[PDB]
Each structure stands twice: as structure tokens, then as C-alpha cells.
Design a protein around this ligand. Structure first.
Ligand SMILES: OC[C@H]1O[C@H](O[C@H]2[C@H](O)[C@@H](O)[C@@H](O)O[C@@H]2CO)[C@H](O)[C@@H](O)[C@@H]1O
Ligand SMILES: [Mg+2]
Length: 535
């Protein structure tokens, strides 16, 4: 089945916070290998591993110094091969992150590049002369704070970095660099991986003319890939990323992926118009297989908003394929980000039902199946550098990166010592051991939802058609050939009622969800979901 990815569910693993098996407080590959049975018990189709490659860990993995090796803190290449084999033996696909838009400054490429203007790798990165007054070439801002340019005295030149200063951006306008990254991907492809999560996929190319970005009109909706307090949201990003040439490169990338049947790619979109960019990137069947945005990774979460997102995406290319995610290593956990003012146990269930019922692929973040809320990390335990620039208006991403609670024992059974990030007390209450045999628990709801999803083709890659179910409900039909399912969701803490826009043949029960269908009237209690078979 070469089309497993088109509708499949992927479980994201953040290597540093999954399981420590070496007793150093940091998660490693062998721990993941140890918990692959649990992962498979989740009824997911595969996994996505955040960067485990050689890195100074300034951005904790996303600042790579060696693309073709495992950082000794996570383990070895052989350990990864073992992980891959065990995951394959359990029927799990293995996707790994690929951070090719920027390297660490400790990467040999940049170490050679920064020496002068004539060295073999001088144009592998984005270098530019200062303005006559000595200031950066343009008004481009780094997401992690300050200018996107940093002066280097060896070359008398600013280098570009959309993120950390220790994360210089790769110059994709230089062909040999692009090809170098392609080969770096071919390495892992030859190892036998099942796919790649493409980090900052729309960031690859920049405007070679280094043109200034226009400011954002005051009172307009800021970009969804950054907090409000970030000055990065003050300007419209048109020249610093999302260049036309990128499309071409995508094709190239796709071609590489096409050399290995069964493989797939999911790109991370960070753009002013994310749905349009995703649809543009995943259409044609000759570029990205799929991609995800920040549309479901932000604050709005009502049925009206979800309807708006779906409508906005359906406006675009019909041959595009979205991947939907409500949580990851960059945002506040959905149980808190979306359901802070909702029921702690009831809301995540129906939210996950919605996520699993959307047309497209799914990214399920580690712990989200347990309904884990965001952890409040104290200032002296902050690890993420992004949490030290906008404090206290923005405290970084460490809250969603606290270690996985396997038991309610010491350190959640994550480590025999104090972990790199502290263990959340609330997470101990929602630990796997406490949750493994609880029928009312979120974990079993996830298992049942995914099993139910697996048993219905319409819920894999069927068409989605919105129906009028009212303001405070989310209703649509999923249709694939023989099957047509009516899906209605109540995301509120109140009982909702509606008249069925279509006629129903039967009810489809799943995971203790309860709704009453009397005549033409469907009634859903708080945080309940209703699946039905359309006549
Ligand atoms: O590797 C740097 C950074 O990139 C990714 O996230 C970015 C995203 O691409 C941007 O659009 C924007 O939203 O900033 C994000 C980081 O806050 C990675 O997912 C992230 O882990 C990494 O730090
Ligand atoms: Mg370890």
C-alpha cells in the first residue's frame, strides 16, 4: 500500500522527553525503541521523530552539525537502525525530521564558509555586505529575536538567520547546496526510513535582491506561527521566505522521494497565508505529499472557526492534501491551548474525535492521547532560548516539552534522576499506568477512535461536505464509494440540538460517546460526538 500516508495517522515523538534509558535525565533512542509497543498499541500508522542528529542542542536538535549521524546524547546510528527495525516489525512507519533550511554554526559547511569570500563554501550560506551605515542589509527579523542578520568580522559581512544566530540559513540559490541537502536526505532514505517531516519547508529560498518587507496594517490578524508579543508579526513576510523558486525545488525533492516507493513527506508551513501555501505545496502530485499549518495550532477553536478553516481550504486546489495537527513541540498543548476553559477529561476526547474525523492526514503529539495539559516551567528551569527573549509575555515552548509520564512513580518513571525538564505533577495523575486499564480514560478513547477510524474507508480519505448543523455544532459528511457517514460534533460544555440535514439509516457507536436521535432531531450532550450512516 503505497498510499498509506494519504490519510494515515502519525505519532510525533520528541526524543528528549519520551524515555531516558541511560540515567542521564535526557530521553534517548533506545527508550523510544522500548516504548514502540505502546506506540503501536495506540493504533497509529507510524511515527515522526524530532531531530536526533548531531547537534550543540542550542535549539535542541534543530541546529544540526552533522546530517548523517546520531548525536551521542540520543545514542548511535546502530541504535536508530534497531529502532527502525522494531518499529517496522510492529507495522509502524518511521518518519524523521529534516532540517535542511539551516545548519548549526558549528557545522563544517559554515565553519568553512565564514572564513572568507573565496573558500569553496562561501556561497553555501546567505552573506551580504552591510549598509553604508553598517546596519543589516534589510529589515528582516529573526523569529527568535533581533535582526535576521548577524555580522561576521572575518568576511566583513552579515549572514542570514531566520532563527538563532547559531542557525545560519542555507543559500538555496546555490545549486550545489540544494544537491548536498538532497544527498543528505538520500542517506536516510537508503537507510530505509519511511518518510520525512520537512522543517520550515517554505523557508528554503529567499529574495536574492534582499528587498525589505512591508509592514502589517495595524489591526490586522497577525501571523499564526508566532506569539503576539513578537515583533516578527509586525511585518508581512514575502521576501524572506516563500519564494517561487521553492516550488521548483519541491519538485526536485519529490523526485528523490519518488525513487523510493512508499515514502512520504510532510512539510511544516510558516506563512502569512498558511492554507494557500499548504494547498500550493501539496498540489500537482509532483511536490509535497502533505503539509501542516498553524491554523489548528493557535487560539481559535470553536465550531465556527473550524468551519471557516475547512471552507478556506476547500476554496483552494482539490488535489491538495492536508495534514492536521492540534499539538506539537512548538505550541501550548491543545488540552490547555484549546480546552483550558473546558472539561479537563471530556473536551480532549471530542477534540481528538474532530481531529481524527477531518479530511486528511493526522499528526498526534506525544502525551496528547493522555490529555496532558501545558506544564508551567519556572524561570530557573527554562531550557528553550525562545523562552528567554519575550519573558514573561511569552515563556517559550518548554511547557509542551516536559518528559512523558509513564508511571505515577518518581519522575513519572521517565528517568532515575532529575530530567532535563521538570516532571509535571498533573501529568503523574494522567500517567500511562493509571490510564492503561481505565475505560473512561482518554487513552482508550484514542485507541477506540483510531480503531473505529480504521474500520471506515470514508474516514481514511473520503470526501468532506459541510452540512448545516447550527452555530454551536460541527457537522459534515465523509464519503468514499460505498460509504457515506454523517459526523456531528459538540465542542461546547452545553447540550446542543439540531435537525438532521440528511436522512440517517443507522447509528455508529464509538468510545462511550452518547447522542440521542429522535425523529428528525439529533441531541448531543456536552462534549459528545455522533457518527451515523447516511441513507
Ligand atoms: O528550526 C527552527 C524552528 O523551526 C520550526 O518552527 C518554526 C516555524 O518553522 C516558523 O514558521 C515559526 O513558527 O517559528 C517556529 C519555531 O518557533 C521547528 O518546528 C522548531 O522546532 C524550530 O525551533
Ligand atoms: Mg538518556
Amino acid at each position: 500500500n503505497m498510499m498509506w500516508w494519504r490519510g494515515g495517522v502519525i505519532y510525533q515523538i520528541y526524543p528528549r522527553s519520551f524515555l531516558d534509558s541511560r540515567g542521564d535525565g535526557v530521553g534517548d533512542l533506545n527508550g523510544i525503541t522500548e516504548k514502540l509497543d505502546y506506540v503501536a498499541s495506540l493504533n497509529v500508522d507510524g511515527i515522526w521523530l524530532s531531530p536526533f542528529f548531531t547537534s550543540p542542542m542550542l535549539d535542541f536538535g534543530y541546529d544540526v552539525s552533522d546530517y548523517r549521524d546520531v548525536d551521542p546524547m540520543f545514542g548511535t546510528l546502530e541504535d536508530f537502525k534497531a529502532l527502525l527495525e522494531k518499529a517496522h516489525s510492529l507495522g509502524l512507519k518511521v518518519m524523521i525530521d529534516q532540517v535542511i533550511s539551516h545548519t548549526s554554526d558549528q557545522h563544517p559547511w559554515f565553519q568553512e564558509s565564514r572564513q572568507n569570500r573565496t573558500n569553496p563554501k562561501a556561497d553555501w550560506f546567505v552573506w551580504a555586505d552591510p549598509k553604508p551605515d553598517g546596519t543589516p542589509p534589510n529589515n528582516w527579523l529573526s523569529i527568535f529575536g533581533g535582526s535576521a542578520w548577524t555580522f561576521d568580522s572575518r568576511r566583513q559581512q552579515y549572514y542570514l538567520h531566520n532563527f538563532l544566530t547559531s542557525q545560519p540559513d542555507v543559500n538555496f540559490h546555490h545549486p550545489e547546496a540544494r544537491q548536498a541537502q538532497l544527498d543528505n536526505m538520500r542517506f536516510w532514505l537508503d537507510l530505509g526510513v519511511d518518510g520525512f517531516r520537512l522543517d520550515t519547508v517554505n523557508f528554503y529560498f529567499h529574495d536574492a535582491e534582499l528587498r525589505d518587507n512591508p509592514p502589517v496594517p495595524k489591526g490586522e490578524a497577525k501571523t499564526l506561527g508566532a506569539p503576539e508579543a513578537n515583533p516578527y508579526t509586525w511585518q508581512r513576510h514575502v521576501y524572506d521566505l516563500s519564494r517561487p523558486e521553492n516550488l521548483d525545488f519541491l519538485k526536485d525533492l519529490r523526485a528523490l522521494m519518488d525513487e523510493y516507493p512508499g515514502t512520504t513527506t510532510v512539510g511544516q508551513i510558516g506563512d502569512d497565508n498558511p492554507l494557500e501555501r499548504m494547498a500550493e505545496y501539496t498540489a500537482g502530485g509532483d511536490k509535497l505529499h502533505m503539509a501542516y499549518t498553524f491554523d489548528l495550532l493557535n487560539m481559535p477553536h470553536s465550531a465556527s472557526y473550524l468551519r471557516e478553516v475547512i471552507e478556506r481550504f476547500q476554496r483552494l486546489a482539490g488535489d491538495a492534501w492536508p495534514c492536521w495537527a492540534t499539538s506539537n513541540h512548538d505550541v501550548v498543548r491543545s488540552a490547555t491551548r484549546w480546552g483550558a476553559d473546558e472539561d479537563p477529561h471530556a473536551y480532549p476526547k471530542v477534540m481528538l474525535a474532530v481531529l481524527f474525523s477531518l479530511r486528511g492526514s493526522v499528526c498526534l503529539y506525544q502525551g496528547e492521547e493522555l490529555g496532558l495539559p501545558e506544564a508551567d516551567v519556572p524561570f530557573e528551569r527554562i531550557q528553550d532560548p525562545y523562552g528567554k527573549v519575550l519573558w514573561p509575555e511569552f515563556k517559550g515552548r518548554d511547557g509542551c516539552r516536559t518528559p512523558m509520564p509513564w508511571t505515577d512513580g518518581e519522575q513519572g518513571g521517565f528517568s532515575p534522576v532529575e530530567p532535563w525538564l521538570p516532571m509535571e505533577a498533573r501529568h503523574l495523575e494522567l500517567a500511562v499506568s493509571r490510564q492503561q486499564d481505565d475505560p473512561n480514560a482518554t487513552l482508550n478513547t484514542v485507541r477506540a477512535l483510531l480503531a473505529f477510524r480504521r474500520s471506515h474507508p470514508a474516514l481514511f480519505d473520503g470526501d468532506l461536505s459541510l452540512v448545516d448543523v447550527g452555530d454551536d455544532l460541527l457537522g459534515f459528511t465523509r464519503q468514499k464509494g460505498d460509504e457515506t457517514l454523517l459526523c456531528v460534533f459538540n465542542l461546547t460544555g452545553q447540550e446542543q440540538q439540531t435537525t438532521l440535514p440528511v436522512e440517517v439509516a443507522s447509528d455508529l457507536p464509538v468510545a462511550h460517546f452518547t447522542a440521542t436521535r429522535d425523529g428528525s432531531t439529533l441531541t448531543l450532550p456536552a462534549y459528545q460526538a455522533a457518527f451515523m450512516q447516511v441513507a
